């Protein structure tokens, strides 16, 4: 949850290179 | 509202019980013969299409 300290624990798309067709 | 590609048909049990169910098939394809559970005899029996209910 946004207010909580664990906000963003599930973020994963910054660890993968962006895919472009 | 679109081109009629499928049709609804009545599948009649071959056990003689008279239990029927409705299935959808392609209009151009051949008549369906299916193995389907018949509650009257309580086991899977061969069904054969008898009539076309409506166009889907």
């Amino acid at each position: 949850y946004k207010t909580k300290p664990t906000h963003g624990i599930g973020k994963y798309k910054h660890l993968i290179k962006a895919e472009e067709p | 509202k679109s081109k009629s590609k499928n049709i609804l048909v009545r599948m009649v049990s071959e056990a003689g019980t008279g239990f029927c169910f409705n299935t959808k098939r392609n209009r151009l394809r051949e008549k369906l013969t299916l193995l389907h559970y018949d509650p009257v005899v309580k086991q899977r029996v061969l069904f054969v299409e008898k009539k076309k209910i409506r166009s889907l």
């Binding site: - | 609804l8 409705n22 959808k24 209910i53």
Partner: protein, 95 residues
């Protein structure tokens, strides 16, 4: 609704109600689900089972159905081998 009939000066029953609803003596009304015989080919088994259920009406509907029927329909009946005999009386109902 006809509150006072011209011939007898008595309140009349709406027969449309009698054709669709069962009244249990406890005051509950039982109905069938709308569309339970419609387009079964496009409905799932779970949905079709829900549609086959005999379901109760809410308080507001029950009050309306009571007003639209005369007292004759609310009497206690003793039909022989009545399927709904058990459901006429409530049990362990607190308020």
């Amino acid at each position: 609704l006809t509150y006072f009939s011209a011939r007898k000066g008595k309140r009349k029953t709406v027969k449309a109600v009698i054709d669709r609803f069962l009244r249990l003596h406890c005051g509950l009304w039982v109905r069938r689900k709308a569309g339970y015989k419609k387009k079964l080919w496009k409905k799932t088994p779970a949905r079709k089972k829900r549609l086959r259920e005999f379901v109760f009406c809410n308080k507001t509907q029950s009050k309306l159905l009571d007003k639209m029927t005369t007292s004759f329909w609310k009497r206690r009946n003793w039909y022989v081998d009545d399927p709904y005999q058990k459901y006429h009386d409530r049990t362990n109902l607190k308020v």
